[PDB]
Amino acid sequence: MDAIKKKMQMLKLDKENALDRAEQAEADKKAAEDRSKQLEDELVSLQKKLKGTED
Amino acid sequence: SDKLKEAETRAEFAERSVTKLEKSIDDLEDELYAQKLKYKAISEELDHALNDMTSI
DSSP, X not given: OOHHHHHHHHHHHHHHHHHHHHHHHHHXXXXXXXXXHHHHHHHXXXXXXXXXXXX | OHHHHHHHHHHHXXXXXXXXXXXXXXXXXXXXXXXXXXXXXXXXXXXXXXXXXXXX
16 A cells, blocks of 8 residues: 555654654753763862862 | 146246346345445545544
8 A cells, every 4th residue: 555654654753753862862961961060060179269268 | 728828837937037036136236235335334444544644
C-alpha cells in the first residue's frame, strides 16, 4: 500500500527528532551545571579574599 | 390423450426446474450481498485507520 509507509516513516522520524533534541538539551544542561559549580567555587574564594581585604 | 399427458409431464418438470433455479439464484445473490457487505466494511475500516493516522 501507500499510507502505511509514509505515516510510519514520519512517526519514526518524529520520535528520532525528539530523542536527539532531548540529548542535545541534556548535554548542554550538564555542561552548564558544571560551569555553574565552577562559578560557585570561585565565588566563595572571591568572598574570602574580599573579607580579608575588608579586615 | 397420451400426447397431452406427455406434454403436461414435461411442463411440470420444467416448472420444478425453474423453481430450483430461482432458489439457487436467490442463494447466490444473498452470498454476493454478504461479500459486498464484507468489502464495504473492510473499505470503511481502512478509511477509519487512514483518518486516525492522518489525524493522530
